[PDB]
Amino acid sequence: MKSVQTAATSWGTVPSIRVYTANNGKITERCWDGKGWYTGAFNEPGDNVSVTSWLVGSAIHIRVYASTGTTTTEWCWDGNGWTKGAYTATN
Amino acid sequence: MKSVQTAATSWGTVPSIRVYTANNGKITERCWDGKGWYTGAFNEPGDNVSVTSWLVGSAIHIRVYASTGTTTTEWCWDGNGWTKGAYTATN
Amino acid sequence: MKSVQTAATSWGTVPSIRVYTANNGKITERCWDGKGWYTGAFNEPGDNVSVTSWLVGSAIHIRVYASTGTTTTEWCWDGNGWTKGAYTATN
Ligand SMILES: OC[C@@]1(O)OC[C@@H](O)[C@@H](O)[C@@H]1O
Ligand SMILES: OC[C@@]1(O)OC[C@@H](O)[C@@H](O)[C@@H]1O
Ligand SMILES: OC[C@@]1(O)OC[C@@H](O)[C@@H](O)[C@@H]1O
Ligand SMILES: OC[C@@]1(O)OC[C@@H](O)[C@@H](O)[C@@H]1O
Ligand SMILES: OC[C@@]1(O)OC[C@@H](O)[C@@H](O)[C@@H]1O
Ligand SMILES: OC[C@@]1(O)OC[C@@H](O)[C@@H](O)[C@@H]1O
């Protein structure tokens, strides 16, 4: 019995938390902004996940690294929707 | 599981570091505060681990996400003990 | 199928990002500082990887925890080359 795999990030002092879970090839996102957990907009394929985030002033930026096989895809949140990032592995 | 699985967080400029290792279904904690590595109070079940933390002043707040199977348990350090948090993977 | 396993850290407001990938027993590093992804100096054996980093002023310090079997090795970046750290899982 394998286990799901998670990645977590947080920012500010409320704080906001985002937890990403890779489960059966699908990565989903749960969100905390101080008043209960809810399901976020991130939904992308992957068996492995890592995450980092940074603030510019008050604006959060999130990068999620989703891996299937040997291919890692980066996904970007910059305040107005998830988009694919430029990340590639060694060529 | 071939190898153990780790997660790490750090805070301040000394820094303090906490490293969580999932090994044989148990997660344990090693701590650095600038003066040598020692074993921390965290000990909970899990095959997978992730962590995030934030400061309020000089006071650290840690959240560890411990997963076994498809069950992810959030553990909260807010200065005095590890308490089960409100996190669920789905409302 | 099995997939590679990653860990990510970031700092500053550009930001700089480092992504560590464990692939078939080797951990390598990809780097972003605003101007394209490139291959970093980090290269160490391991089947699992986690990372944390902290700034002291504008100087970044990175700790990478590489695991093979039950043995976790800490690798330290402090501005001038990767060195093995004092981390042990026991004692
Ligand atoms: O406010 C919720 C939300 O917009 O926060 C930023 C990202 O985590 C999004 O996926 C998420 O749906
Ligand atoms: O704004 C998108 C982006 O430029 O952000 C920094 C890195 O995450 C890049 O790979 C990514 O394409
Ligand atoms: O000083 C050690 C300690 O109290 O630091 C905060 C948490 O990491 C605890 O598990 C840990 O025992
Ligand atoms: O104080 C505990 C708590 O409220 O902290 C913020 C989140 O980690 C919650 O899931 C958790 O229950
Ligand atoms: O500029 C790239 C670099 O020096 O940045 C700090 C560390 O990530 C190093 O491994 C890496 O080669
Ligand atoms: O400067 C290296 C070092 O002292 O930094 C703090 C911890 O990462 C230690 O394990 C490590 O040896």
Among residues B5, A18, A52, which one has the least CA distance to residue C72? B5
| Bridge partners of residue A69, in order along the sequence | none
In the block, residue with structure tokens 């291959």: C39
- Does the C-beta of B61 come closer than 6 Å to ligand 4? no
CA C18 to centroid of chain Cα atoms: 7
Contact residues of A toward B, CB < 8 A? 1-13, 15, 17, 19, 21, 23, 28, 30, 32, 36-39
CA of A86 to the centre of ligand 5 (A): 18
How far apart CA A44 and CA C40 sit, in angstroms, is 27
C13: tokens are 């407001």
The torsion of the CA quartet C40, A72, A90, B2, rounded to 10 degrees, works out to: 80
**Vertex C44: Cα angle to A68 and A51 (nearest 5):** 40
How far apart CA A62 and CA A45 sit, in angstroms, is 17
| A64 touches A75 (CB < 8 A) | yes
Give the burial string for B23-54 (b: 16+ CB within 10 Å, else e). Answer: beeebbbbebeeeebeebebebebbbbbbbbb
Q: What residues of C are in contact with residue A23 (Cβ under 8 Å)? A: none
Question: What was the resolution (in A) of this experimentally determined structure?
Answer: 1.6
In the block, residue with structure tokens 């996190």: B87
Can you list the domains of chain B with their CATH numbers? Answer: 5-84 (2.40.128.190)
User: Residue A32 is which amino acid?
Assistant: W
Residue A88: partners with Cβ closer than 8 Å, 6 or more residues away: C30, C37
In the block, residue with structure tokens 């603030």: A55
| C36 touches C51 (CB < 8 A) | no
| B41 touches C82 (CB < 8 A) | no
| Bridge partners of residue B53, in order along the sequence | B62
Residue C7: partners with Cβ closer than 8 Å, 6 or more residues away: A50, C19, C20, C49, C50, C51, C64
CA of C78 to the centre of ligand 2 (A): 25
Half-sphere exposure of C61 (CA within 13 A, CB side): 17
- Does the C-beta of A87 come closer than 6 Å to ligand 2? yes
Partner-chain residue, chosen from A19, A23, A39, that has the shortest CB–CB distance to B65: A19
Q: SS3 string of C56-70?
A: ECCEEEEEEEEEECC
Residue B59: partners with Cβ closer than 8 Å, 6 or more residues away: B78, B79
Sheet with B59-68, strands from edge to edge, namely B48-56, B59-68, B71-77, B82-84
CA distance C15 to chain B (A): 18
Distances (CA, A) of A22 to A18, A91, B8, C11: 13, 26, 19, 25
Q: What residues of C are in contact with residue A67 (Cβ under 8 Å)? A: 3-6, 21
Q: Is the dihedral of CA A62, B54, B77, C56 positive or negative?
A: positive
Q: Which residues line ligand 1 (CB under 6 A)?
A: A 18, 29, 31, 40-42, 77
